[model samples]
Target: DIRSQSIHFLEQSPSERLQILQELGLGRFKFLSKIRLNDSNVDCVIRFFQNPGQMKFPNLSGADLSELNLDEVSLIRGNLSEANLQGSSLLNADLIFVNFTKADLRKADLRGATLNGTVWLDTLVDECQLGIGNGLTKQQRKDLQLRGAEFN
Candidate 1:
């Protein structure tokens, strides 16, 4: 029945909704991608990206986040594998150590972001602005270049 608890996500109020999300635990809410992806549950997750104060990193694997403006969000150590972040504005966002395996970031803006110690297996970064993003330990930057990541 716990997994079924996702039914109550339609509830409103940003303050009250965070509590509901915590009940399912921070990252264990695996149903995030399983749900409609546009449900109110995603709002709770968005709140974390909004401020990220005193909050644990939330698992965002396989979520529908296309074309959203995620500027300056401190998503440090967060998981976002297989997620769709196409055309999203990640400018100046703290994306340190975040998993981006198979994630779609085509045309996304990552200007001024720090990608230190992050994972990037098969992650699409084509046509995206990856300049000034202090990333990699040498090999990682090389990997991004080989993966078709544009530095414009």
Candidate 2:
């Protein structure tokens, strides 16, 4: 199960483990909080910040998350370089600056998300879905779109 796999990764750090369990809405994994929230535990904080990028559990980065529910999650600056999200749900989520460089998103659902400055360059997306009249990919000109815009 994804929860169990999450637990296994969390076990490496007691605080991270507990926090993940809590974020999963599992009523606190080990009945501890202060330990995980200490200023000394920078690693745990980084993990907490990055945990949302691993919602696909075992498959992680390149998993086939074609039709999963990922509502209200935070995936800021995530590297989904080659993930397969043909029909994934990203409703009301904060996916700011996510890197879908080469992700296979044939029909991924991103209706309600704020994609004001996200990168869609080199992404293996269906050209039809991009629509024919959209202006710029990223919001700003200085914002990096993709290293290779017309590669594939």
Candidate 3:
């Protein structure tokens, strides 16, 4: 419903759409859409989602998301490779089938986050905090530990 509404507003001019979004209490929604494009404005996309907790089909590959709060968000099949997520909070987030290859996850929180089929190839997990959750293999857990990630 919200996605459809947002889509409908896309046809309008930027100023008109911004007016509508602000009227609808979705002022931050503009940044959420722009972050998907991975452009020069990526640095300005901060605190855009406010932990909606379910964000499917997000294409955030190679985006800079450092120091943001993404707690409890569900990211399915999302491409986050090479993204800078340092110091971000992913508490209780669903991260099924997400690609995080070469991403910077240092000092990030993964407590209670689902890890089903998550691709962490070459992703930095140093000093990251992990908690108990389902869908992770023993090898995966062990690998994270070996990579200097801390368990909570």
Candidate 4:
């Protein structure tokens, strides 16, 4: 499967692994091996996955996401607490089950992003878990936050 193929390449050196990640389009095959994300480019790869419908993640614990464009990325089951998503464009991203306890979401543009299931628990990835709520499960209305936030 694609996951297997991607992992095989991940075992290679950083140069080779980056080549494969660039080719496969990132995070598209992370589900195969949860351990394949023991690399630096984890954030970049996952960001590429977000370019799509913004699907799931392999594992993004310590990714150095200093500056990234994560607009409309679906971070389902993503571990982003203290992962340095600073200055990142998270516009309309689905942040379900994402760990955001100490996550620096300072200037993040959460226009249409879904925050349900995202937990702000303690540090350490395990300390976090999927919170309660579906895609549309916020207490206040969508329009209450951002002006251009899309709602159903």
TM-score of each: 0.68, 0.47, 0.67, 0.49
The number of the candidate with the highest TM-score is 1
Q: What's the C-alpha lDDT at position 123 in model 2?
A: 71
Per residue, candidate 2 scores C-alpha lDDT tens digits across 36-75 of 2222233333333455434332122454455556655566
- Candidate 1 residue-wise lDDT, 1-152, digit = tens: 43234444433444444565565454433333233336443554565444444456656777777777777767788888888888888888888999988999898888888899788888998876788558767777677867777765
Q: Which stretches of candidate 1 lie over 4 Å from their true place?
A: 1-55
- What digit string (tens of lDDT, one per residue) describes model 4 on residues 1-152? 44444345546765565566557565354322222344554443444444534544535665555445666666687877666554556666677777765655444445566776666543222211112223645543332234222233
Best by lDDT: 3
lDDT digits (tens) for residues 1-152 of candidate 3:
44445444544666776786577565644434322223422332322233333433666677777776888776777778888889999888878998999999999998988889998899999998888635789898899889988877
- In candidate 3, which residue pairs clash? none
Global lDDT of model 4:
0.50
**What lDDT does each candidate get?**
0.68, 0.47, 0.70, 0.50
TM-score, candidate number 1: 0.68
Descending-lDDT candidate ranking? 3, 1, 4, 2
Q: What is the lDDT of residue 64 in candidate 2?
A: 47
In order of listing, the candidates' clash counts read 0, 0, 0, 1
Using TM-score, rank the candidates from best to worst: 1, 3, 4, 2
- Candidate that beats the other on TM-score, 1 or 4, i.e. the better one: 1
How much is the lDDT of residue 148 in candidate 2?
Answer: 19
